[PDB]
Amino acid sequence: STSDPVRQYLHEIGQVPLLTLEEEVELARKVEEGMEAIKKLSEITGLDPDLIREVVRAKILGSARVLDPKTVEEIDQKLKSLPKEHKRYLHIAREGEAARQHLIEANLRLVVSIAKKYTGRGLSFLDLIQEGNQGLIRAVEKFEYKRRFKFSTYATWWIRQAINRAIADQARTIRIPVHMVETINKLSRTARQLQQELGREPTYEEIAEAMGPGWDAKRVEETLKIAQEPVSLETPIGDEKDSFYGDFIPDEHLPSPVDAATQSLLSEELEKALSKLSEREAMVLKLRKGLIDGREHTLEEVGAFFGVTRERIRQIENKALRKLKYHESRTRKLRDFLD
Amino acid sequence: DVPSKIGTLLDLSATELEQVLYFSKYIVLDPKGAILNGVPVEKRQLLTDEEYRELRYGKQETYPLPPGVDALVKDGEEVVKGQELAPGVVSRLDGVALYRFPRRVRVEYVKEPKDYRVQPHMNVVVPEGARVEAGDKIVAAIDPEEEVIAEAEGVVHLHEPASILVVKARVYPFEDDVEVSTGDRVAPGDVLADGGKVKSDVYGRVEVDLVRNVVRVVESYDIDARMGAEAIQQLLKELDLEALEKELLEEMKHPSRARRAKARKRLEVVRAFLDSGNRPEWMILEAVPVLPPDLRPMVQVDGGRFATSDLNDLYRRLINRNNRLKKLLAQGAPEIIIRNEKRMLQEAVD
DNA sequence: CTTGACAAAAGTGTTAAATTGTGCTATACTGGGAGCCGTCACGGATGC
DNA sequence: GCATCCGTGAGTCGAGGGAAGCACAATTTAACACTTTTGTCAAG
């Protein structure tokens, strides 16, 4: 179904026949042989094993895929110039990389069967499948056919591991580490078991005691507070679809017209108050309090500006500050701004 | 947005555009001398997935023989459509027939038709009808105890294949080193091995069989067909608006009113791009702008709870899918997995 | 305006403890699951 | 012509409505001294 992404994907993975026991072993053996062959090629030519694998992979995947091609072609010729005995490993590597793609493609039904059990936990069905596919790619690399265990036995561990980790890393707007997600899930499981046995919602003391040593009611409450999802700003309220959460949340960052006006009134009055001070005394206070550069200047830092000693500035500033106190008592024009 | 601006410039229907955009059909960009059902492939032709595999990788079908029964054909024999490969199965295509998993190897010693049973975890290491000197390995296996070797000189015969693989390809026997390796694409006259002695007689993908020491060139073409916006963007970058305008103007004089009406609608879009200075390929996004955070706030309510906008969720989905596609591309994932992620990424932007 | 000693505050390692990020598990497992009608009525625009 | 897909449908208010674990390497954070930098005190 074109309009249904899931049906379209299921149709595509249904075009690859399932591997038989004989077919699966041959593909796995070729993958293992190719990896070993690449190791020998690196030893023979001294090239990085990662570099050789990328070149071999690039040639198998063909020109339908976007290290630039010029370097890929150059190294490819260098491999093709090896002696006949050394050239064989290149043939084995090419067959190994081709087999790896087929082995991955034949097991895309396995990931779907696993991934259908993880829906409703924060990720959509197609997101779970893609995270499962990444686990399936890892299983192919690490799988060992010598042990004679079937592929689904070993690949199921990696497929579930990738799907479960993806939920822990992508299911919440505010990401919570993996260890904290494990604690949260365990805490929820413990509460549900206590809830079914007490016939009521357990208190934080019941849950803390159930969890084990190192757990108290205060920690249980903190974990529950941490595990709170944010609420959407577009959630409707009321039957009419004309009111939302965002319509009731004030903006408290930008100053209000009253706040801005009182800040300018305070600055205006202080400018007049500092006018009564001497030419230098007013400047010292405007520096020691950061009224010029925006940031406070230390006694020594101020002293360099006026070439006076540190102790002297502390004297004039203290004296200049005392005078401002005397004037205010005579007018009381500045006490309102202090709250 | 009906009628689509991208479709009008490219002359693609609403259904045609959606099929390519959401990875349902291929659009040809370079036929590379490809023939589909005997009709040469032309540019801008929509290819279904089945057609693309036929052209790009060739024809091959695998027929599973019943257990115990022995194939009536030999290993490496060309067959025609409808020919009986096994006593109960007849092929549907003409090509080389190859034994998949010979269950039993019947080596004839000279002094003795000794028979050996092959299991799923064992593989035959020598071709059919090969003189194996006493000591050479015949069937390899994980356990050296179960390894099968030849007591003395003989001829190995393969029997009881698990299945018969019919492939439409050309087989070129060789003796010395092969000039090509598996996965290479060659055209007629290309050297294959023996210093130019063996040459490709047809286009196809070359796969070298070490066991049979022959080179199989699977008949296929290096067609350039792509899906998604990467194909459409390629088409939009090649449009010559000046050239297109002249063609539309000439079609504006056609006696038919319906034909003249259609050309006017197309040429109105072309005129808009020519006069405005915009480029048609700018309708495909290569970078997605991200809104400033204060217009999609994540604010803390008075009670300590957090409130956020829906744009952050939509942005996160696009970033999560974009990053995953990058990881898959670096891992050399199969085309099915890459196509699904590309289709998901397209939907995340939508 | 200038020193000289003075204790506190701010700043610079150094290191152990929390915290977080990543890899791994081998019996065999191989194509989803929800929905579903007072389906809203009309006019415009397009594809035939 | 018919068949199909898309966008449109008054205003203000109001309360009310807010399902795995473990082992380990890495990284970040908090404690602890110990070392300059800053404000002070008393003088001259």
mmCIF file of C-alpha atoms in Angstrom, chain B:
data_model
loop_
_atom_site.group_PDB
_atom_site.id
_atom_site.type_symbol
_atom_site.label_atom_id
_atom_site.label_comp_id
_atom_site.label_asym_id
_atom_site.label_seq_id
_atom_site.Cartn_x
_atom_site.Cartn_y
_atom_site.Cartn_z
ATOM 1 C CA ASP B 1 -0.185 21.651 -3.793
ATOM 2 C CA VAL B 2 -2.368 20.875 -6.810
ATOM 3 C CA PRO B 3 -1.133 21.297 -9.480
ATOM 4 C CA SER B 4 2.389 20.494 -8.258
ATOM 5 C CA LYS B 5 5.067 22.964 -9.323
ATOM 6 C CA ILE B 6 7.674 20.188 -9.458
ATOM 7 C CA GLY B 7 5.398 18.017 -11.590
ATOM 8 C CA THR B 8 4.582 20.846 -13.994
ATOM 9 C CA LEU B 9 8.239 21.641 -14.706
ATOM 10 C CA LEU B 10 9.145 17.954 -15.103
ATOM 11 C CA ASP B 11 5.870 16.944 -16.822
ATOM 12 C CA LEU B 12 5.182 14.267 -14.204
ATOM 13 C CA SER B 13 1.702 13.308 -13.054
ATOM 14 C CA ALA B 14 0.639 13.528 -9.427
ATOM 15 C CA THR B 15 0.861 9.733 -9.206
ATOM 16 C CA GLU B 16 4.190 9.581 -11.052
ATOM 17 C CA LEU B 17 5.773 12.153 -8.737
ATOM 18 C CA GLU B 18 4.574 10.414 -5.567
ATOM 19 C CA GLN B 19 5.820 7.011 -6.736
ATOM 20 C CA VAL B 20 9.349 8.351 -7.265
ATOM 21 C CA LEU B 21 9.353 10.699 -4.266
ATOM 22 C CA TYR B 22 8.294 7.949 -1.843
ATOM 23 C CA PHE B 23 10.429 5.170 -3.332
ATOM 24 C CA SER B 24 7.790 3.177 -5.195
ATOM 25 C CA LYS B 25 9.246 3.359 -8.724
ATOM 26 C CA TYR B 26 12.554 4.236 -10.348
ATOM 27 C CA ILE B 27 13.050 7.009 -12.898
ATOM 28 C CA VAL B 28 15.727 6.445 -15.526
ATOM 29 C CA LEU B 29 18.472 9.065 -15.764
ATOM 30 C CA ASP B 30 20.881 7.233 -18.111
ATOM 31 C CA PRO B 31 19.708 4.110 -19.973
ATOM 32 C CA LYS B 32 23.315 2.965 -20.566
ATOM 33 C CA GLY B 33 22.137 1.040 -23.614
ATOM 34 C CA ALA B 34 19.590 -0.954 -21.615
ATOM 35 C CA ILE B 35 16.939 -3.076 -23.335
ATOM 36 C CA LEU B 36 13.717 -3.866 -21.457
ATOM 37 C CA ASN B 37 11.532 -6.559 -23.045
ATOM 38 C CA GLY B 38 13.279 -5.897 -26.361
ATOM 39 C CA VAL B 39 12.496 -2.152 -26.340
ATOM 40 C CA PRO B 40 15.441 0.189 -25.623
ATOM 41 C CA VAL B 41 15.147 2.091 -22.348
ATOM 42 C CA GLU B 42 14.760 5.866 -22.615
ATOM 43 C CA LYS B 43 15.454 8.621 -20.109
ATOM 44 C CA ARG B 44 12.746 9.752 -17.680
ATOM 45 C CA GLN B 45 11.109 6.308 -17.887
ATOM 46 C CA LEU B 46 9.544 5.010 -14.676
ATOM 47 C CA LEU B 47 10.797 1.523 -13.780
ATOM 48 C CA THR B 48 9.122 -0.699 -11.213
ATOM 49 C CA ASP B 49 11.294 -2.494 -8.673
ATOM 50 C CA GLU B 50 10.941 -5.800 -10.527
ATOM 51 C CA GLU B 51 11.967 -4.184 -13.821
ATOM 52 C CA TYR B 52 14.967 -2.453 -12.233
ATOM 53 C CA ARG B 53 16.288 -5.701 -10.748
ATOM 54 C CA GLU B 54 15.874 -7.446 -14.110
ATOM 55 C CA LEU B 55 17.902 -4.783 -15.922
ATOM 56 C CA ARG B 56 20.400 -4.006 -13.160
ATOM 57 C CA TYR B 57 21.075 -7.537 -11.871
ATOM 58 C CA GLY B 58 19.627 -9.924 -14.474
ATOM 59 C CA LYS B 59 17.363 -12.954 -14.385
ATOM 60 C CA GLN B 60 17.895 -15.950 -12.112
ATOM 61 C CA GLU B 61 15.511 -18.387 -10.429
ATOM 62 C CA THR B 62 16.198 -21.175 -7.930
ATOM 63 C CA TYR B 63 14.243 -24.439 -8.093
ATOM 64 C CA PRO B 64 14.350 -26.666 -4.974
ATOM 65 C CA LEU B 65 14.663 -30.329 -5.890
ATOM 66 C CA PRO B 66 12.894 -32.895 -3.704
ATOM 67 C CA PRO B 67 15.133 -34.764 -1.258
ATOM 68 C CA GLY B 68 16.718 -37.931 -2.634
ATOM 69 C CA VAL B 69 15.867 -37.297 -6.283
ATOM 70 C CA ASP B 70 18.715 -36.577 -8.701
ATOM 71 C CA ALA B 71 18.691 -33.847 -11.334
ATOM 72 C CA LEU B 72 18.375 -34.866 -14.980
ATOM 73 C CA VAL B 73 20.697 -31.998 -15.961
ATOM 74 C CA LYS B 74 24.423 -31.673 -15.311
ATOM 75 C CA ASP B 75 26.353 -28.919 -13.556
ATOM 76 C CA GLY B 76 26.989 -26.053 -15.962
ATOM 77 C CA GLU B 77 24.577 -27.064 -18.744
ATOM 78 C CA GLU B 78 22.604 -24.418 -20.614
ATOM 79 C CA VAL B 79 18.836 -24.946 -20.568
ATOM 80 C CA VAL B 80 15.861 -23.433 -22.371
ATOM 81 C CA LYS B 81 12.522 -22.263 -21.016
ATOM 82 C CA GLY B 82 10.294 -25.165 -20.010
ATOM 83 C CA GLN B 83 13.115 -27.714 -19.948
ATOM 84 C CA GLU B 84 12.939 -30.242 -17.119
ATOM 85 C CA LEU B 85 15.745 -29.610 -14.635
ATOM 86 C CA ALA B 86 14.706 -32.351 -12.201
ATOM 87 C CA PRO B 87 12.208 -35.235 -12.494
ATOM 88 C CA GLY B 88 9.474 -33.020 -11.037
ATOM 89 C CA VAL B 89 10.519 -29.427 -11.770
ATOM 90 C CA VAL B 90 10.932 -27.616 -15.100
ATOM 91 C CA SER B 91 12.690 -24.264 -15.388
ATOM 92 C CA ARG B 92 11.015 -21.024 -16.466
ATOM 93 C CA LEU B 93 14.079 -19.327 -17.995
ATOM 94 C CA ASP B 94 17.015 -20.232 -20.225
ATOM 95 C CA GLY B 95 20.535 -20.043 -18.843
ATOM 96 C CA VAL B 96 23.350 -21.907 -17.149
ATOM 97 C CA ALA B 97 22.292 -24.505 -14.572
ATOM 98 C CA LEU B 98 24.431 -24.778 -11.438
ATOM 99 C CA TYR B 99 24.227 -27.290 -8.599
ATOM 100 C CA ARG B 100 23.635 -25.463 -5.322
ATOM 101 C CA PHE B 101 24.328 -28.024 -2.565
ATOM 102 C CA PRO B 102 25.362 -31.444 -3.912
ATOM 103 C CA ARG B 103 24.313 -33.837 -1.157
ATOM 104 C CA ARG B 104 26.487 -36.714 -2.411
ATOM 105 C CA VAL B 105 29.880 -36.777 -4.139
ATOM 106 C CA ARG B 106 30.643 -39.937 -6.131
ATOM 107 C CA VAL B 107 34.394 -40.142 -6.739
ATOM 108 C CA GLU B 108 35.536 -42.890 -9.129
ATOM 109 C CA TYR B 109 38.866 -44.347 -8.025
ATOM 110 C CA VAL B 110 41.081 -46.193 -10.511
ATOM 111 C CA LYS B 111 42.543 -49.551 -9.497
ATOM 112 C CA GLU B 112 35.423 -48.148 -7.475
ATOM 113 C CA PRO B 113 32.424 -45.769 -7.342
ATOM 114 C CA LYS B 114 32.782 -44.671 -3.731
ATOM 115 C CA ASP B 115 29.952 -42.458 -2.467
ATOM 116 C CA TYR B 116 30.130 -39.814 0.262
ATOM 117 C CA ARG B 117 27.255 -38.046 2.010
ATOM 118 C CA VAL B 118 27.428 -34.266 2.464
ATOM 119 C CA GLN B 119 25.720 -32.508 5.376
ATOM 120 C CA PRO B 120 24.552 -28.890 5.719
ATOM 121 C CA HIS B 121 27.753 -27.879 7.541
ATOM 122 C CA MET B 122 29.993 -29.388 4.832
ATOM 123 C CA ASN B 123 30.899 -27.898 1.456
ATOM 124 C CA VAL B 124 32.414 -29.459 -1.655
ATOM 125 C CA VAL B 125 35.848 -27.955 -2.321
ATOM 126 C CA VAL B 126 36.420 -29.337 -5.838
ATOM 127 C CA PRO B 127 34.455 -29.049 -9.108
ATOM 128 C CA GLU B 128 32.633 -31.844 -10.886
ATOM 129 C CA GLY B 129 34.728 -34.190 -12.998
ATOM 130 C CA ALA B 130 38.095 -33.124 -11.578
ATOM 131 C CA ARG B 131 41.093 -35.445 -11.289
ATOM 132 C CA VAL B 132 41.948 -35.382 -7.573
ATOM 133 C CA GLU B 133 45.327 -36.832 -6.641
ATOM 134 C CA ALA B 134 45.439 -39.123 -3.616
ATOM 135 C CA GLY B 135 45.402 -36.793 -0.591
ATOM 136 C CA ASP B 136 43.680 -33.726 -2.031
ATOM 137 C CA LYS B 137 40.748 -32.470 0.022
ATOM 138 C CA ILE B 138 37.326 -33.267 -1.456
ATOM 139 C CA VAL B 139 34.704 -32.156 1.100
ATOM 140 C CA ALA B 140 35.656 -29.567 3.713
ATOM 141 C CA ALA B 141 34.004 -29.441 7.127
ATOM 142 C CA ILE B 142 34.409 -27.778 10.512
ATOM 143 C CA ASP B 143 35.700 -30.962 12.168
ATOM 144 C CA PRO B 144 38.868 -32.443 10.622
ATOM 145 C CA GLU B 145 37.536 -35.854 11.687
ATOM 146 C CA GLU B 146 34.546 -35.503 9.341
ATOM 147 C CA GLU B 147 36.683 -34.098 6.510
ATOM 148 C CA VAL B 148 36.393 -36.179 3.331
ATOM 149 C CA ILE B 149 39.510 -36.949 1.278
ATOM 150 C CA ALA B 150 40.347 -39.205 -1.664
ATOM 151 C CA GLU B 151 42.279 -42.405 -0.990
ATOM 152 C CA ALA B 152 43.797 -42.449 -4.490
ATOM 153 C CA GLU B 153 43.384 -40.914 -7.939
ATOM 154 C CA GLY B 154 39.837 -40.589 -9.201
ATOM 155 C CA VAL B 155 37.127 -38.406 -10.702
ATOM 156 C CA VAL B 156 34.638 -36.502 -8.540
ATOM 157 C CA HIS B 157 30.975 -36.496 -9.587
ATOM 158 C CA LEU B 158 28.347 -34.317 -7.914
ATOM 159 C CA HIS B 159 24.870 -35.734 -7.365
ATOM 160 C CA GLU B 160 21.644 -35.047 -5.491
ATOM 161 C CA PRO B 161 21.758 -31.229 -5.583
ATOM 162 C CA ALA B 162 19.663 -29.402 -3.018
ATOM 163 C CA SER B 163 18.450 -26.999 -5.717
ATOM 164 C CA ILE B 164 19.142 -25.936 -9.302
ATOM 165 C CA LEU B 165 20.128 -22.322 -9.980
ATOM 166 C CA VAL B 166 19.264 -21.094 -13.480
ATOM 167 C CA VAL B 167 21.129 -17.895 -14.379
ATOM 168 C CA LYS B 168 21.029 -15.986 -17.679
ATOM 169 C CA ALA B 169 24.780 -15.464 -17.978
ATOM 170 C CA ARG B 170 27.845 -16.333 -20.050
ATOM 171 C CA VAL B 171 30.517 -18.737 -18.776
ATOM 172 C CA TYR B 172 34.136 -18.162 -19.837
ATOM 173 C CA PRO B 173 36.576 -20.919 -18.808
ATOM 174 C CA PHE B 174 40.034 -19.687 -17.845
ATOM 175 C CA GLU B 175 43.353 -21.130 -16.685
ATOM 176 C CA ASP B 176 45.548 -18.242 -15.494
ATOM 177 C CA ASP B 177 44.761 -15.279 -13.241
ATOM 178 C CA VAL B 178 41.510 -13.421 -13.928
ATOM 179 C CA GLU B 179 41.763 -9.725 -14.772
ATOM 180 C CA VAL B 180 38.418 -8.969 -13.075
ATOM 181 C CA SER B 181 36.880 -9.913 -9.726
ATOM 182 C CA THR B 182 33.390 -10.449 -8.342
ATOM 183 C CA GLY B 183 30.997 -7.530 -8.723
ATOM 184 C CA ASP B 184 32.762 -5.848 -11.644
ATOM 185 C CA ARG B 185 30.633 -4.547 -14.513
ATOM 186 C CA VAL B 186 31.936 -5.183 -18.027
ATOM 187 C CA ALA B 187 30.805 -4.503 -21.592
ATOM 188 C CA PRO B 188 31.572 -6.481 -24.773
ATOM 189 C CA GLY B 189 35.270 -6.832 -25.525
ATOM 190 C CA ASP B 190 36.399 -6.288 -21.932
ATOM 191 C CA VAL B 191 39.313 -8.458 -20.825
ATOM 192 C CA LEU B 192 38.442 -11.185 -18.318
ATOM 193 C CA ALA B 193 41.608 -13.262 -17.829
ATOM 194 C CA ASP B 194 44.626 -14.797 -19.564
ATOM 195 C CA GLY B 195 46.000 -11.406 -20.587
ATOM 196 C CA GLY B 196 43.140 -10.504 -22.914
ATOM 197 C CA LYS B 197 42.534 -13.996 -24.311
ATOM 198 C CA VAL B 198 39.090 -14.169 -22.658
ATOM 199 C CA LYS B 199 36.807 -11.198 -23.322
ATOM 200 C CA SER B 200 33.234 -10.320 -22.410
ATOM 201 C CA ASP B 201 30.701 -10.892 -25.193
ATOM 202 C CA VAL B 202 27.795 -9.044 -23.522
ATOM 203 C CA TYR B 203 27.090 -6.490 -20.811
ATOM 204 C CA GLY B 204 26.663 -7.866 -17.323
ATOM 205 C CA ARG B 205 27.905 -8.309 -13.785
ATOM 206 C CA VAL B 206 30.983 -10.528 -13.510
ATOM 207 C CA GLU B 207 31.172 -13.142 -10.748
ATOM 208 C CA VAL B 208 34.286 -15.335 -10.641
ATOM 209 C CA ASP B 209 33.815 -18.944 -9.506
ATOM 210 C CA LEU B 210 37.050 -20.259 -8.000
ATOM 211 C CA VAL B 211 35.737 -23.809 -7.524
ATOM 212 C CA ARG B 212 34.786 -24.098 -11.204
ATOM 213 C CA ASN B 213 37.623 -21.722 -12.232
ATOM 214 C CA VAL B 214 35.265 -20.039 -14.695
ATOM 215 C CA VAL B 215 34.024 -16.454 -14.916
ATOM 216 C CA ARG B 216 30.257 -15.926 -15.072
ATOM 217 C CA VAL B 217 29.092 -12.625 -16.567
ATOM 218 C CA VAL B 218 25.442 -12.239 -15.555
ATOM 219 C CA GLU B 219 23.663 -10.414 -18.377
ATOM 220 C CA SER B 220 22.701 -7.010 -16.970
ATOM 221 C CA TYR B 221 23.088 -3.311 -17.721
ATOM 222 C CA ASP B 222 24.643 -0.513 -15.667
ATOM 223 C CA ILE B 223 21.439 1.507 -15.864
ATOM 224 C CA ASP B 224 21.221 4.777 -13.914
ATOM 225 C CA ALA B 225 17.775 4.817 -12.292
ATOM 226 C CA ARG B 226 17.064 6.459 -8.945
ATOM 227 C CA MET B 227 14.175 7.087 -6.559
ATOM 228 C CA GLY B 228 13.299 9.882 -4.172
ATOM 229 C CA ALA B 229 14.105 13.573 -4.283
ATOM 230 C CA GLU B 230 17.708 12.784 -5.239
ATOM 231 C CA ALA B 231 16.390 11.658 -8.629
ATOM 232 C CA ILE B 232 13.937 14.557 -8.969
ATOM 233 C CA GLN B 233 16.571 17.107 -7.945
ATOM 234 C CA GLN B 234 18.817 15.670 -10.660
ATOM 235 C CA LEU B 235 16.060 16.250 -13.221
ATOM 236 C CA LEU B 236 15.372 19.769 -11.936
ATOM 237 C CA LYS B 237 19.049 20.756 -12.097
ATOM 238 C CA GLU B 238 19.193 19.807 -15.792
ATOM 239 C CA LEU B 239 16.146 21.824 -16.899
ATOM 240 C CA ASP B 240 17.003 24.574 -19.378
ATOM 241 C CA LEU B 241 14.228 27.091 -18.773
ATOM 242 C CA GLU B 242 15.173 29.091 -21.871
ATOM 243 C CA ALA B 243 15.012 25.948 -24.014
ATOM 244 C CA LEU B 244 11.807 24.773 -22.323
ATOM 245 C CA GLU B 245 10.102 28.132 -22.873
ATOM 246 C CA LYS B 246 10.716 27.950 -26.626
ATOM 247 C CA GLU B 247 9.228 24.447 -26.810
ATOM 248 C CA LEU B 248 6.166 25.521 -24.819
ATOM 249 C CA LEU B 249 5.707 28.611 -26.995
ATOM 250 C CA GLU B 250 5.781 26.488 -30.156
ATOM 251 C CA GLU B 251 3.174 24.173 -28.628
ATOM 252 C CA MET B 252 1.147 27.326 -27.882
ATOM 253 C CA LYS B 253 0.256 27.564 -31.596
ATOM 254 C CA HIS B 254 -1.301 24.099 -31.840
ATOM 255 C CA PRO B 255 -4.869 24.187 -33.224
ATOM 256 C CA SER B 256 -6.220 22.154 -30.299
ATOM 257 C CA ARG B 257 -7.586 24.286 -27.468
ATOM 258 C CA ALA B 258 -6.803 21.625 -24.856
ATOM 259 C CA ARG B 259 -3.177 21.413 -26.001
ATOM 260 C CA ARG B 260 -2.789 25.200 -25.967
ATOM 261 C CA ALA B 261 -4.370 25.401 -22.507
ATOM 262 C CA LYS B 262 -1.909 22.869 -21.074
ATOM 263 C CA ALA B 263 1.142 24.621 -22.528
ATOM 264 C CA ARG B 264 0.021 27.936 -21.029
ATOM 265 C CA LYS B 265 -0.155 26.469 -17.519
ATOM 266 C CA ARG B 266 3.319 24.944 -17.822
ATOM 267 C CA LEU B 267 4.782 28.111 -19.342
ATOM 268 C CA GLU B 268 3.277 30.238 -16.563
ATOM 269 C CA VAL B 269 5.399 28.270 -14.083
ATOM 270 C CA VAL B 270 8.455 28.511 -16.348
ATOM 271 C CA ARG B 271 7.951 32.268 -16.702
ATOM 272 C CA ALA B 272 7.774 32.566 -12.908
ATOM 273 C CA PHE B 273 11.185 30.924 -12.483
ATOM 274 C CA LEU B 274 12.794 32.834 -15.361
ATOM 275 C CA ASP B 275 11.640 36.278 -14.199
ATOM 276 C CA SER B 276 12.001 35.697 -10.444
ATOM 277 C CA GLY B 277 15.572 34.391 -10.598
ATOM 278 C CA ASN B 278 14.733 31.333 -8.499
ATOM 279 C CA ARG B 279 16.157 27.956 -9.431
ATOM 280 C CA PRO B 280 13.805 24.988 -9.909
ATOM 281 C CA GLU B 281 16.026 22.679 -7.836
ATOM 282 C CA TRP B 282 15.575 24.925 -4.782
ATOM 283 C CA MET B 283 12.209 23.187 -4.305
ATOM 284 C CA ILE B 284 14.158 20.172 -2.981
ATOM 285 C CA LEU B 285 15.566 20.747 0.500
ATOM 286 C CA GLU B 286 19.209 19.936 1.201
ATOM 287 C CA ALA B 287 19.317 21.916 4.461
ATOM 288 C CA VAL B 288 16.323 22.254 6.786
ATOM 289 C CA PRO B 289 16.115 25.573 8.678
ATOM 290 C CA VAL B 290 15.516 25.236 12.418
ATOM 291 C CA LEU B 291 13.235 27.742 14.121
ATOM 292 C CA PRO B 292 14.734 29.870 16.920
ATOM 293 C CA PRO B 293 14.238 28.181 20.301
ATOM 294 C CA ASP B 294 12.152 31.008 21.783
ATOM 295 C CA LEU B 295 9.461 30.539 19.108
ATOM 296 C CA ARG B 296 9.189 26.846 20.093
ATOM 297 C CA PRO B 297 9.843 27.227 23.814
ATOM 298 C CA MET B 298 10.481 24.573 26.442
ATOM 299 C CA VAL B 299 9.367 26.571 29.481
ATOM 300 C CA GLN B 300 8.974 25.510 33.110
ATOM 301 C CA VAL B 301 5.494 26.197 34.498
ATOM 302 C CA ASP B 302 5.006 27.654 37.978
ATOM 303 C CA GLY B 303 4.427 24.173 39.398
ATOM 304 C CA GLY B 304 7.810 22.926 38.185
ATOM 305 C CA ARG B 305 6.395 20.958 35.252
ATOM 306 C CA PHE B 306 7.820 21.425 31.757
ATOM 307 C CA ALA B 307 5.778 22.522 28.737
ATOM 308 C CA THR B 308 7.068 22.341 25.166
ATOM 309 C CA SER B 309 5.774 22.870 21.643
ATOM 310 C CA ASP B 310 5.013 20.243 19.012
ATOM 311 C CA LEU B 311 7.779 21.590 16.752
ATOM 312 C CA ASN B 312 10.444 20.132 19.050
ATOM 313 C CA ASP B 313 8.907 16.676 18.600
ATOM 314 C CA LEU B 314 8.801 17.097 14.813
ATOM 315 C CA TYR B 315 12.384 18.391 14.777
ATOM 316 C CA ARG B 316 13.563 15.497 16.959
ATOM 317 C CA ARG B 317 12.009 12.917 14.627
ATOM 318 C CA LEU B 318 13.765 14.439 11.610
ATOM 319 C CA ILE B 319 17.105 14.597 13.447
ATOM 320 C CA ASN B 320 16.747 11.057 14.811
ATOM 321 C CA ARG B 321 15.998 9.682 11.340
ATOM 322 C CA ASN B 322 18.664 11.790 9.617
ATOM 323 C CA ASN B 323 21.349 10.592 12.034
ATOM 324 C CA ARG B 324 20.284 6.949 11.698
ATOM 325 C CA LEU B 325 20.479 7.140 7.899
ATOM 326 C CA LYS B 326 24.038 8.467 8.161
ATOM 327 C CA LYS B 327 25.007 5.527 10.379
ATOM 328 C CA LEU B 328 23.397 3.011 8.016
ATOM 329 C CA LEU B 329 25.107 4.553 4.983
ATOM 330 C CA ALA B 330 28.500 4.250 6.687
ATOM 331 C CA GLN B 331 27.714 0.603 7.528
ATOM 332 C CA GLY B 332 27.084 -0.316 3.885
ATOM 333 C CA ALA B 333 23.563 -1.514 4.601
ATOM 334 C CA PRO B 334 21.483 -3.202 1.885
ATOM 335 C CA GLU B 335 19.407 -1.064 -0.451
ATOM 336 C CA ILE B 336 16.140 -2.200 1.160
ATOM 337 C CA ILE B 337 17.189 -0.812 4.546
ATOM 338 C CA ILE B 338 18.545 2.410 3.032
ATOM 339 C CA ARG B 339 15.384 2.906 0.967
ATOM 340 C CA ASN B 340 13.147 2.519 4.024
ATOM 341 C CA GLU B 341 15.173 5.086 5.968
ATOM 342 C CA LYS B 342 15.187 7.514 3.034
ATOM 343 C CA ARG B 343 11.416 7.102 2.700
ATOM 344 C CA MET B 344 11.021 7.716 6.439
ATOM 345 C CA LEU B 345 13.258 10.793 6.274
ATOM 346 C CA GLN B 346 11.138 12.196 3.441
ATOM 347 C CA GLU B 347 8.010 11.688 5.551
ATOM 348 C CA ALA B 348 9.655 13.296 8.594
ATOM 349 C CA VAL B 349 10.273 16.475 6.592
ATOM 350 C CA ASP B 350 6.696 16.396 5.331
#
